[PDB]
Design a binder for this molecule. Structure first.
Ligand SMILES: *[C@](C)(O)C(=O)N(c1ccc(-c2ccccc2)nc1)[C@@](C)(C(=O)N[C@@H](C)c1ccc(F)cc1)c1cccnc1
Ligand SMILES: *[C@](C)(O)C(=O)N(c1ccc(-c2ccccc2)nc1)[C@@](C)(C(=O)N[C@@H](C)c1ccc(F)cc1)c1cccnc1
Lengths: 298, 299
């Protein structure tokens, strides 16, 4: 009953956040087994001239690393560079290591940001990757290395590590495989995101959310083809639709066709009059199909 | 960098949530130090008429009780009804019982809800108590006994325990002392919900979040005395403000005083005219002052 951007329980991610301190600059690290993942820009302090990472890696002094989880210091042994990640090998092994697996996020999916500062978690909240492979969370200085995760069946899927904040207030993270989302760079040059187009299959589950909760005022008998929308979608800041197979489960209980919401979206997109839907005066892509089913039918 | 309702880390609370079952009704409970707390309506299975809890508490067979945390089954020992809650004593002690304590919340504060189903933690999100003393969150069938909590320095303070769901989709819970908030009944008979009046400080904090976040189209140079607003707040669905000395820090960083917002509240409470503030169609008391300071400046 209701609809809120809720985050999954952060309890398993929480023991792994460490404080990685290389010289002056100190940031957040994900500690799993004997390895500690952190953004490689910790090795940089320039923040003014283009950084030649290939050279600074070979010219690194491990005596300056001091990694910690509270009062314990983990002893640094080695460190290799996996993309934009600086995978650091420490002697102590995280006794608190959950069952983890790395995965990459496909645009539109939801995941959980464990905002951390100085190796201490601050808050957990759910976000979705946008059409530009950037997120719109809440971050302040020192968050570099805060993990993002999805969790299915007592197993953590580290899908995000924070790297940098764009001027857009948009946040760019790396993959745990070392791959910047959206093709951006950890470089001190100005970078601009593209136009954020709303993810269509999240807006649909958001409209079934309104019909399950009885708000049927916006809905009418009109229906549009998957095709005519895909044509209309690009020119109106929306993503195209591949198929409508998964909604058929919800479409039956509601009795509202998939082709019928499309006619509504073409109308409702930049169309909400005074009347709002579920607390929103504009369509939103925050809510996925998975999230709707967990908040509506257990 | 953004305004994002977020919950504090729920790691310490997750060891304590247990599956409490008494025959048909199965719902969640908090396992603190060898005592499981749960709503007293787990004993009742009837949702027709008003139920004599004093007579149902005595018609209680402890042998019927089934508590479990995963595969482990707890052995129930004692059971005393405290208010609208059930303090159940068991043999094993939650060995991971955090630095815990109870509290009752004055209206307007923000706390952290841990929704559970079948003794399984499932989500965690921030919510603030409305003036009617009903939070408004997400709860499906079987979430009775999901604890709320607020954490000040690794010490867990349990403040909520889910009891019932009203008509307005408003959610009602009980403190760990066994008192239904706002004075409600855990009975099936129909029950009214009050008119939600907005907490003024949390609206002011929400407005500073907008001035810090750039949206300054609604702000002009109007200063309003606090009493004229209080006289106006008693007649327009707001609350009277006690002090604005905590806002002294946000006012200096924005350069906008607290008086300007107070007049601005009188302006926009009528309606935002289709122009949203921070992605919000109307004024919102969701963001408390302290939570706004951790997100904007990071304390
Ligand atoms: C990290 C260090 O904790 C941090 O908060 N930010 C940051 C700072 C510097 C770098 C960086 C330095 C040298 C080379 C490459 C990257 N990355 C991240 C903040 C302060 C940040 O990103 N600021 C922006 C303006 C920035 C971009 C690029 C850059 F090189 C330097 C700064 C930051 C603040 C808030 C949230 N996230 C990150
Ligand atoms: C709990 C059992 O998990 C549950 O979801 N609900 C509930 C059901 C019954 C009682 C109750 C039983 C006996 C005596 C008094 C109360 N409390 C809670 C739900 C289904 C619920 O609250 N339904 C409403 C209609 C209800 C209110 C009051 C009442 F006495 C009986 C029923 C529920 C649904 C969704 C969210 N929370 C609770």
């Amino acid at each position: 009953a209701g609809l809120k951007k809720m985050a999954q329980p952060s309890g398993l991610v929480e023991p792994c956040v460490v404080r990685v301190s290389y010289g002056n600059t100190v940031l957040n690290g994900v500690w799993l087994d004997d390895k500690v993942y952190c953004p490689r820009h910790v090795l940089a302090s320039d923040t003014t001239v283009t950084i030649d990472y290939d050279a600074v890696y070979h010219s690194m002094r491990l005596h300056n690393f001091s990694i910690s989880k509270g009062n314990v210091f983990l002893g640094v042994v080695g460190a290799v560079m996996q993309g934009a990640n600086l995978v650091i090998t420490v002697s102590q092994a995280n006794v608190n290591t959950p069952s983890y697996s790395f995965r990459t996020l496909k645009a539109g999916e939801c995941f959980n940001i464990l905002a951390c500062y100085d190796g201490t978690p601050a808050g957990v909240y759910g976000v979705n990757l946008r059409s530009t492979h950037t997120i719109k969370g809440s971050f302040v200085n020192g968050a570099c290395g805060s993990p993002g995760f999805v969790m299915n069946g007592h197993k953590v899927e580290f899908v995000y590590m924070h790297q940098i904040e764009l001027g857009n207030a948009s946040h760019v993270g790396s993959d745990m495989f070392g791959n910047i989302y959206g093709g951006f760079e950890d470089q001190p040059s100005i970078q601009l995101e593209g136009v954020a187009t709303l993810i269509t299959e999240n807006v649909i589950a958001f409209l079934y959310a309104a019909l399950i909760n009885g708000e049927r005022w916006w809905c009418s008998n009109e229906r549009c083809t998957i095709d005519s929308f895909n044509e209309w979608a690009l020119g109106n800041g929306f993503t195209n639709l591949v198929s409508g197979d998964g909604f058929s489960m919800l479409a039956a209980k509601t009795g509202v066709d998939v082709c019928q919401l499309l006619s509504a979206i073409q109308r409702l997109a930049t169309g909400l009059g005074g009347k709002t839907i579920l607390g929103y005066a504009s369509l939103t892509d925050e809510y996925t199909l998975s999230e709707v089913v967990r908040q509506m039918y257990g």
